[PDB]
From a paper:
They both consist of an N-terminal membrane-bound domain with three predicted transmembrane helices, and a C-terminal cytoplasmic region, which encompass ∼50% of the protein and is predicted to form a coiled coil, or more likely two coiled coils.
The vDED domain forms an uninterrupted parallel coiled coil dimer in both structures. Apart from that, the two structures are however quite similar and exhibit a RMSD Cα value of 1.12 Å for 94 aligned residues. This dimer-dimer interface covers an area of 2900 Å2 and is predicted by the PISA server to be stable in solution. For comparison, the radii of gyration (related to and numerically similar to the Stoke’s radius) of the dimer and potential tetramer of BAP31 vDED were estimated to be 29 and 39 Å respectively based on the P21 structure. We therefore conclude that the observed tetramerization interface is unlikely to be physiologically relevant.
Residue numbers in the entry:
A (entry chain A): 172 to 233
B (entry chain D): 173 to 233
Write the structure that this text describes.
């Protein structure tokens, strides 16, 4: 029984391992998406700031 | 044959712990990232509002 019990437990733990791996994969993709969004918004912030600057430049030339 | 199964059992438990922790970390980082996204959206809105006000001021000639 020692060995059959160990088999039961091993299969169970392997299943748990797979479940956790799935969770980690999902969460990882979510994190990747959020990070990439952050970068995107850095670029966009830079651009928008540049346009705000264009306001001042153009006005300085009237 | 038993010692092998014991070995594997412990190995699997260790892997479990590692994954619990890695998942916890990843969730923390996801939370941080989403707060960053939110904050930056708000900064952007503030900036477009600033833009509107400034342009409206310039258009007053």
């Amino acid at each position: 029984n020692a060995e059959v019990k160990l088999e039961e437990e091993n299969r169970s733990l392997k299943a748990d391992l797979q479940k956790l791996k799935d969770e980690l994969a999902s969460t990882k993709q979510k994190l990747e998406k959020a990070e990439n969004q952050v970068l995107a918004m850095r670029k966009q912030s830079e651009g928008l700031t540049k346009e705000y600057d264009r306001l001042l430049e153009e006005h300085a030339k009237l």
